[PDB]
Amino acid sequence: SMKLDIGIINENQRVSMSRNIESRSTSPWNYTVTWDPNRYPSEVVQAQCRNLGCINAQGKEDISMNSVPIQQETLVVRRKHQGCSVSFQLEKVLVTVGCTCVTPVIHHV
Amino acid sequence: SMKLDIGIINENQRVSMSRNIESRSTSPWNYTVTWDPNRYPSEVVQAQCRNLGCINAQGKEDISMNSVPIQQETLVVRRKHQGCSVSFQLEKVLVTVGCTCVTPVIHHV
Amino acid sequence: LERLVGPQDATHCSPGLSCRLWDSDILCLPGDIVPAPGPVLAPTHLQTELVLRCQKETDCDLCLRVAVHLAVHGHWEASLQAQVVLSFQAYPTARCVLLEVQVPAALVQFGQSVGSVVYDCFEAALGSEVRIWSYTQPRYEKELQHTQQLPDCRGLEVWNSIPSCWALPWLQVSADGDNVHLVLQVSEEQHFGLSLYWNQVQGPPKPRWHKNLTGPQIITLQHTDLVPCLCIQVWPLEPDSVRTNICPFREDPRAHQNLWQAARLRLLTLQSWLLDAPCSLPAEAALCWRAPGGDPCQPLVPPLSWEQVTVDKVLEFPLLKGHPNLCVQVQSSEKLQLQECLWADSLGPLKDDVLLLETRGPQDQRSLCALEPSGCTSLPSKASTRAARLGEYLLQDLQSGQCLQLWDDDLGALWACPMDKYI
Amino acid sequence: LERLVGPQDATHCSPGLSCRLWDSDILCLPGDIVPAPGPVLAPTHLQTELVLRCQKETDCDLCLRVAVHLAVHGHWEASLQAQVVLSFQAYPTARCVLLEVQVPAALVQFGQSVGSVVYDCFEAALGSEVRIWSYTQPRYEKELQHTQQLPDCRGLEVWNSIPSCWALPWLQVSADGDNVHLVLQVSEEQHFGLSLYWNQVQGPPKPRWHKNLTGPQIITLQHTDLVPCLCIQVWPLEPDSVRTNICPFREDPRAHQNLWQAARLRLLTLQSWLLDAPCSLPAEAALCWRAPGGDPCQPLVPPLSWEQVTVDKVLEFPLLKGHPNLCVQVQSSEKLQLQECLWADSLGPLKDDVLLLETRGPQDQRSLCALEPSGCTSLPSKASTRAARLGEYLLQDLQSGQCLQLWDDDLGALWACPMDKYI
């Protein structure tokens, strides 16, 4: 094993601009905060589409369209303990970040 | 600094199910592959909304709605070299994973 | 304090306490709770103050000052120390800060507060919800969590101390050049999109104009657009920009003028008609009887009534048949606005027919009256009016069935009889 | 080979080459290109073979076998070694594998291929594009990149060797019980959604039935739904499930039967009408003249023509006025389907009026013919038909203006004259 420095390089960018994306979206989603003290980040937010269909102008469900999650692989750090020889190992977690509205696949005969 | 093991714990889940989300989405996006050999992952995919508005049933742009990116903070590993003392440092990268269709903010007087 | 100098992170603290910053956006892990081997430093509660971080006078972020009080907990048994982590999560971003704190052995009182430490600061966007955690490393007690909410751009603190709150596409109106002008005092480099719509009530969509522009600019209005519900929508050409909605014609006079100038009556079925208008204003409608002389159209109230009519919705007649001398009068605010005779091309023009109104008295009798321009005249009458001179011939015409019935009731009926036989 | 045993990763290689696997989903970094201190092992090119990984006979993933050929490059100066990384990116996932390879000093030939090594395998979903990189650590040359594409569920390999390709909501039809039945032989635990729609051509949306269900199930059809464009859409209640579309009524007979049974003609303006139908079939329309006797409606071709009419679109008449004896006949496939007389409630019922067709001969003469049930008869005529006996009175009626003109031309005209004066 190799040396992992404790400091995290920060991009410094603050591109973050939208607000309440999850509620304003035509494929709205809800958030689920998963917590692990031996994981970095300790708080991992998991999204979940609220509906199968998409929300129309009147606020009613439209089953002709599908809400689908956008999932991305990410890395977290796992803290391990083996007495005095504390070690760290990378771990891949699949995070659902939000949902989008897609047209369903129309197979036909 | 502490020991980071070379193996990466894998979730083993294969939840991955949709296909061509980026094209079937009402807020379609394009991908830009950024490459860095001293970064893990070496390939970092950045999304970009194709339009400002959303695509209607006829395939034309609708400026009454906005395509907005969903951005998530992620961790990558930076390889550093200081002769024989190779070391690693975590780095935060902001990744645009996809786009969603939202209702614009309507401030009024 | 509200405004802070360049973005150098800072930590200060209570009298006699040693405090060093380690923030390299450090990796923070609370981990499991271990037992306390004697006295430990433990955070009692958290508090936050809102600050501003300006790196240049132009670029200022909303910055959140964090503070934590410390006490001495654990077992009881020469000065104490600890390191405390402040985690700051504000979706999507997160940042962690590590502080080293020494407290002297003379302030060490088991069961009291020993001081507090303050960090400036965590930058965050406007109106963003912020979770803040705090814990010692190692962790001896439960974690400290606080959930806060930052103010919108609206809010005296924000918009006064922040310059970034002013990208408004400022709008001005100038109706002085006999037309109407819209002035957009923005910056020269401002890319933005602009929409002119007709703000309908139910089923709002009625687009009228759309343009991508790089202002400032002055837009001229056509005489066909000045309607009350004509509203403006503006936003910069940025991802998820905020759109401004204004309706300055809600009570412009020439707006209503052109609105009722553009309104139209159009027939569907013999017993259904339709009203077309750019906006939707309240209005009543009633059938009217127009003499071939021209304008003096006497409304048929009674036996009818002014029924409400809504724009882009059908109203149904109560007539048995249509007649060329039957117009429709439409009033709003109790003022006659439109007068259109819908049968003038299908069955018109106006025929030389006299209107009669019979009233079924007791014992099912029948008494007749003729609607002349000078009110109605009962028949037979001794006057010299055209109807009274020939009233007997008119009664002969009716009782032979030569007149056209237009409305039937239990105690009333309406008829029209042609007059070409006497002229 | 196609099917492999339990998901134990495996690496084999050429005769005489030593090959060990290190895959813990390892951290792979190509890094910068360093110069070669003597001979190095270098990958020449990449190749892929498609495999199947089954952990139980039920759960089988599409697995991609990777292989890389090796040569000896670098400087020229006792056996060689290297470690090679295979990176596998397939959005969203990625996995890396590290292989240790020794090659003996007797196969070391500078400028030839020394062998190849094969890894099984990289699991990936169906139809997913896969980037595969390969490089030595340390990296002495450029990276190896290959971009491939995996087959859909359709494709003999996939659907035959994979059991996961069969979740089809199988549909069967049973029109034997005098009605129509739809059978959905699925699994008992199958949650799915089902839609019945009327498949219009332009502007397709016409929903008819929507239901969330847990089949298998048998759905019964009402006599009002059996129309040609009646189509079925099915999909399991899963995120982004695939929907099946079928139209089995495209040529059912009772479908067209009920379709033309449900079609309606409806008047808009005096010179505009509309056709309502569940589906949109090709059809022609023409005005028709109906005698008070009943059904024998003679079409008015000539001087008219069968104009195409489309469902849910207006067709405009060429008439000057409407008449109670004017029906509209609508045919499809050159067979009379609908016959509706649209003026029978506004101006009807059928009047005792004879239809006349005048033709402006040379020198602008006028010769008249009367459309009787037994074709047309020129006037005046010497026959005993009702029109020829009274043809002189009919000509007297026309030239006095007592007849109603319905159509004017440069060399033709149509009229209708009442007959109550002789009966």
Q: DSSP secondary structure string, D386-416? A: HHHHTHHHHHHHHHTT-SEEEEE-SS-EEEE
* Cis upstream peptide for D418 (omega within 30°): no
Helix or strand run (H / E) with residue D257: helix D253-262
What is the phi/psi pair of residue D142, to 5°? -70, 160
End-to-end CA distance of chain B: 57
What is the phi/psi pair of residue D388, to 5°? -75, -35
- Rounded Cα distance, A6 and A20, in Å: 33
* The residue to which tokens 């996932």 are assigned: D93
Subunits with 3+ Cβ pairs within 8 Å of D are A, B, C
Residue A3 maps to a domain? no
Q: How far is CA D246 from the centre of its chain?
A: 9
Residue A1 maps to a domain? no
* Number of domains into which chain A is organized: 1
What amino acid is encoded at A45 in this protein? V
- Rounded Cα distance, A65 and B63, in Å: 20
Residue A23 maps to a domain? yes
DSSP states of C77-132: ---EEEEEEEEEEETTEEEEEEEEEEE-TTS--TTSEEEEEEEEEEEE-TT-EEEE
Cβ burial of D285 (10 Å; 0-12, 13-18, 19+) is: buried
Residue A52 to residue D242, Cβ atoms within 8 A: no
DSSP state of C163: S
Q: Which residues contact D346 (CB under 8 A, 6 or more apart)?
A: C270, D267, D322
Instruction: Rounding to the nearest 10 degrees, give the CA dihedral for residues D273, D277, D281, D287.
Output: -30
DSSP states of D290-305: E-TTSS-EEE-TTTS-
Give how far C26 is from chain A: nearest CA, Å: 5
- Chains B and C form CB pairs within 8 A to the count of 46
CATH number for the domain that contains residue B46? 2.10.90.10
Best mutation target, B4, B6, B25, to test chain D (most D CBs within 10 A): B6
CA D203, D209, D214, D215 dihedral sign is negative
Select from C143, C127, C72, C62 the least CA-distant residue to C102.
Answer: C72
Residue A89 to residue B27, Cβ atoms within 8 A: no
A contacts of B87 (beta carbons < 8 Å): 2-5
Enclosing domain of residue A78: 18-104
Residue B38 maps to a domain? yes
- Rounded Cα distance, A88 and A1, in Å: 10
DSSP states of D85-139: EEEEEETTEEEEEEEEEEE-TTS--TTSEEEEEEEEEEEE-TT-EEEEEEEESS-
Residue A6 maps to a domain? no
* The residue to which tokens 């190749």 are assigned: D47
Q: Do D332 and D281 touch, CB atoms closer than 8 A?
A: yes
- Rounded Cα distance, B18 and D367, in Å: 76
> How does C217-250 read in b/e, with b if 16+ C-beta sit within 10 Å?
bebebeeebbbbbbbbbbbbeebbbbbbeeebbe
Radius of gyration, CA atoms only, chain B:
19
Cβ burial of C423 (10 Å; 0-12, 13-18, 19+) is: exposed
Residue C26 to residue A8, Cβ atoms within 8 A: yes
Please count the other Cβ atoms lying within 10 Å of the Cβ belonging to residue D391: 21
Give how far B49 is from chain C: nearest CA, Å: 9
What amino acid is encoded at A86 in this protein? V
Select from A106, A13, A24 the least CA-distant residue to A64.
Answer: A106
The answer to whether A77 contacts chain C (CB < 8 Å) is yes
The minimal CB distance from C29 to the residues A7, A19, A40 is found for: A40
| Residue D277 in tokens | 């139908």
Residue C29 to residue A79, Cβ atoms within 8 A: yes
Give how far B98 is from chain A: nearest CA, Å: 7
Helix (H, G, I), strand (E, B) or coil at C357: strand
Residue A11 maps to a domain? no
Select from C396, C414, C394 the least CA-distant residue to C404.
Answer: C414
Residue D242 to residue A104, Cβ atoms within 8 A: yes
Residue A45 maps to a domain? yes
